[PDB]
Enzyme design. Structure first.
Site, PDB file in Angstrom:
ATOM      1  N   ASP A 140       0.611  -1.075   0.006  1.00 21.17           N
ATOM      2  CA  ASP A 140       0.087  -0.406   0.615  1.00 21.17           C
ATOM      3  C   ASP A 140       1.144   1.087  -0.397  1.00 21.17           C
ATOM      4  O   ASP A 140       0.490   2.610   0.451  1.00 21.17           O
ATOM      5  CB  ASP A 140      -0.384   0.095   1.290  1.00 21.17           C
ATOM      6  CG  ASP A 140      -2.331   0.696   1.255  1.00 21.17           C
ATOM      7  OD1 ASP A 140      -2.442   1.786  -0.090  1.00 21.17           O
ATOM      8  OD2 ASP A 140      -2.749   1.114   1.943  1.00 21.17           O
ATOM      9  N   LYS A 143       3.216   3.903  -5.641  1.00 23.08           N
ATOM     10  CA  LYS A 143       2.093   2.626  -6.934  1.00 23.08           C
ATOM     11  C   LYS A 143       3.865   2.253  -8.172  1.00 23.08           C
ATOM     12  O   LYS A 143       3.160   0.508  -8.317  1.00 23.08           O
ATOM     13  CB  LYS A 143       1.441   3.486  -7.915  1.00 23.08           C
ATOM     14  CG  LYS A 143       2.080   4.396  -8.742  1.00 23.08           C
ATOM     15  CD  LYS A 143       1.200   5.593  -9.187  1.00 23.08           C
ATOM     16  CE  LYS A 143       1.278   6.516  -9.463  1.00 23.08           C
ATOM     17  NZ  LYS A 143       2.802   6.847 -10.383  1.00 23.08           N
ATOM     18  N   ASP A 168      -3.326  -2.935  -2.351  1.00 20.64           N
ATOM     19  CA  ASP A 168      -4.708  -1.968  -2.375  1.00 20.64           C
ATOM     20  C   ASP A 168      -4.204  -1.165  -3.285  1.00 20.64           C
ATOM     21  O   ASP A 168      -3.609  -0.953  -4.042  1.00 20.64           O
ATOM     22  CB  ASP A 168      -4.663  -1.568  -0.749  1.00 20.64           C
ATOM     23  CG  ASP A 168      -5.761  -0.470  -0.844  1.00 20.64           C
ATOM     24  OD1 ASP A 168      -6.862  -0.390  -1.305  1.00 20.64           O
ATOM     25  OD2 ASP A 168      -5.307   0.670  -0.157  1.00 20.64           O
ATOM     26  N   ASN A 169      -5.597   0.034  -3.545  1.00 18.04           N
ATOM     27  CA  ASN A 169      -5.008   0.392  -5.426  1.00 18.04           C
ATOM     28  C   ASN A 169      -4.784   0.388  -6.633  1.00 18.04           C
ATOM     29  O   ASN A 169      -3.875   0.593  -7.077  1.00 18.04           O
ATOM     30  CB  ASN A 169      -4.059   1.163  -5.128  1.00 18.04           C
ATOM     31  CG  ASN A 169      -4.659   2.458  -3.605  1.00 18.04           C
ATOM     32  OD1 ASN A 169      -4.353   2.644  -2.329  1.00 18.04           O
ATOM     33  ND2 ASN A 169      -5.861   2.919  -3.039  1.00 18.04           N
ATOM     34  N   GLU A 198     -15.214   6.736  -2.090  1.00 17.33           N
ATOM     35  CA  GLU A 198     -16.098   7.851  -2.188  1.00 17.33           C
ATOM     36  C   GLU A 198     -15.827   8.967  -2.853  1.00 17.33           C
ATOM     37  O   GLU A 198     -15.061   9.379  -3.111  1.00 17.33           O
ATOM     38  CB  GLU A 198     -16.719   7.992  -0.960  1.00 17.33           C
ATOM     39  CG  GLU A 198     -17.057   7.289   0.057  1.00 17.33           C
ATOM     40  CD  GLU A 198     -17.771   7.233   1.696  1.00 17.33           C
ATOM     41  OE1 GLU A 198     -18.111   8.403   1.807  1.00 17.33           O
ATOM     42  OE2 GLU A 198     -17.654   6.540   2.313  1.00 17.33           O
TER      43      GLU A 198
END
Ligand SMILES: Nc1ncnc2c1ncn2[C@@H]1O[C@H](CSCC[C@H](N)C(=O)O)[C@@H](O)[C@H]1O
Ligand SMILES: [Cl-]
Ligand SMILES: [K+]
Ligand SMILES: [K+]
Ligand SMILES: [K+]
Length: 219
Positions: A140, A143, A168-169, A198
């Site tokens: 995490d 990237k 993640d991501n 969100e």
């Protein structure tokens, strides 16, 4: 002005219950939702993380990227007595907030924060930190280091058949080269999990990649 990180810890100390990790997580998510910090609302990805910890019951977990300690608290609260989370964090100010967050949660003894870049610390795990192999890795951090650091973990002998990677991501902002590698490699069995963000109202995701052992040394 005040950093996000110092304000997240402030909110926890003022609103959460000491030694109640669930209350700490909920406080962080409540505050970050109110601020509309989409990447800092962790409950959706947290459902997936919790399921992985519950299924595999890892004794030794490595986290890449701590920030303010949300994911460290999330995982450490489900680890058994005597189990260990190592978390690597390049920014000392984030390491400091994460430490304070863990202390408030009462989980500090289960976690060791390693201050440095993952690419520098990973090759030290065997000899300096006495690691055999990791049971789980939570990726995490930056990237562009997901794929390189996976390859580095492999090369340093830190993965075994059965080691669970959870990244993640992988969709937003994305880690497409990492995904292509693990999905295409016979050394990983992969599963994808959708996880909402969100405000952007987008379906991000996590990838579970279970290492199978190295490919044949020959062709
Ligand atoms: N090469 C690297 N090694 C270690 N930490 C790194 C890194 N590149 C970025 N980071 C750290 O990775 C973090 C990404 S945010 C981490 C969020 C956290 N896992 C949570 O769920 O709450 C930041 O704190 C950043 O400083
Ligand atoms: Cl990538
Ligand atoms: K175990
Ligand atoms: K990340
Ligand atoms: K594969």
């Amino acid at each position: 002005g005040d950093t996000k990180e110092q304000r997240i810890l402030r909110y926890v100390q003022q609103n959460a219950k000491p030694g109640d990790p669930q209350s700490v997580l909920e406080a962080i998510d409540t505050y970050c939702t109110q601020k509309e910090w989409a990447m800092n609302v962790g409950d959706a990805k947290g459902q997936i993380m919790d399921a992985v910890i519950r299924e595999y019951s890892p004794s030794l977990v490595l986290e890449l990227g701590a920030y303010c300690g949300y994911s460290a608290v999330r995982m450490a609260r489900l680890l058994q007595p005597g189990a260990r989370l190592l978390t690597m964090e390049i920014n000392p100010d984030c390491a400091a907030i994460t430490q304070q967050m863990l202390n408030f949660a009462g989980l500090q003894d289960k976690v060791t924060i390693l201050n440095g870049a993952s690419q520098d610390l990973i090759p030290q795990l065997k000899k300096k930190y006495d690691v055999d192999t990791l049971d789980m890795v939570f990726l995490d951090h930056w990237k562009d280091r997901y794929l390189p650091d996976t390859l580095l973990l492999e090369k340093c002998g830190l993965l075994r058949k059965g080691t669970v990677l959870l990244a993640d991501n992988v969709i937003v902002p994305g880690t497409p080269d990492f995904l292509a590698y693990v999905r295409g490699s016979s050394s990983f069995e992969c599963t994808h999990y959708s996880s909402y963000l969100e405000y952007m109202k987008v379906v991000d995701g996590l990838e579970k990649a279970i290492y199978q052992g190295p490919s044949s040394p020959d062709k």
